[PDB]
């Protein structure tokens, strides 16, 4: 019985919540707080351990962008700090290839990173890899067929519909086909042989549209849209379905969790988070 973990987030200020949803029985479970509140972070899993990467803490004391990598062990319900990233990365994107965690883009103060770095859990070390062709914060990242995709985001001036693919064996990036829509802070994940980009912000409105890149056709297509417009949403995959969690719709911080079944091209509302929030990190184990 694998669970959907949601870490951190934003509502009034950056948050410390770690909660777990069980889709097969609809229950939520409150787990140990993050040591430091964070929003705009990302979550991923390696070898049954949950990692929370980057983000920022906007609080009464001011703002501090995070270079933190922290590791939560579901078996002990304990957080452990890991080696810091080379630089703080707010609104980071993250993906996993061959047991390594790739930290992509994001921001530190006013610097919008094109840089990328890779964590090896067995050594507790970060190493720089080739930088992206574009500076991207609020970037969505997905891994399919041991290739890493960075989609959308914000370069410091414009929000982006562009996307690019990283090839680890040659340590190089190339542009792929651009999305149909500019999306900053979209939900990006992989289901089956497609990369989905759900929601985000286009510079004017929050979006409920969801487009997917089929890697065999190199084409982006709109599928069924979400019920809720949402940016800074969490997203993940559980048992061949996409789960999107929370976000901001332009007026409300959502507690809604919607579920997409690609067999039927339909979204249904499956649960609610215990309170509304945006900017979460999400993963499954």
């Amino acid at each position: 019985g694998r669970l959907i973990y949601t870490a951190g987030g934003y509502f009034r200020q950056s948050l410390s919540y770690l909660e777990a949803y069980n889709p097969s029985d609809g229950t939520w479970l409150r787990l140990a707080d993050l040591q430091v509140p964070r929003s705009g972070l990302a979550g991923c899993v390696v070898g049954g351990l949950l990692y929370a990467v980057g983000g920022r803490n906007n609080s009464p004391d001011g703002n501090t962008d995070s270079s933190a990598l922290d590791c939560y062990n579901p078996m002990t319900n304990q957080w452990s700090p890991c080696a810091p990233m080379s630089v703080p990365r707010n609104r980071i994107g993250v993906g996993v290839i061959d047991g390594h965690i790739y930290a992509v883009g994001g921001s530190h103060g006013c610097i919008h990173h094109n840089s990328v770095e890779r964590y090896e859990p067995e050594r507790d070390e970060w190493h720089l890899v080739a930088p992206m062709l574009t500076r991207r914060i609020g970037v969505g990242v997905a891994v399919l067929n041991r290739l890493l995709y960075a989609v959308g985001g914000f370069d410091g001036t414009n929000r982006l519909n562009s996307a690019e693919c990283y090839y680890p064996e040659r340590n190089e990036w190339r542009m792929i086909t651009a999305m149909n829509t500019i999306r900053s802070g979209a939900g990006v994940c992989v289901l089956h042989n497609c990369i989905y980009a759900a929601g985000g912000y286009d510079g004017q409105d929050q979006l409920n549209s969801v487009e997917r890149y089929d890697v065999e056709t190199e084409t982006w297509t709109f599928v069924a849209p979400m019920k809720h417009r949402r940016s800074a949403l969490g997203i993940t995959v559980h048992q061949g379905r996409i789960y999107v969690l929370g976000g901001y719709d332009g007026h409300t911080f959502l507690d809604s969790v919607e579920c997409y079944d690609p067999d039927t091209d339909t979204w249904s509302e499956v649960t609610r988070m215990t309170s509304g929030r945006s900017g979460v990190g999400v993963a499954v184990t």
Partner: peptide, 4 residues
């Protein structure tokens, strides 16, 4: 994007 003040909301995260």
């Amino acid at each position: 994007e003040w909301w995260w």
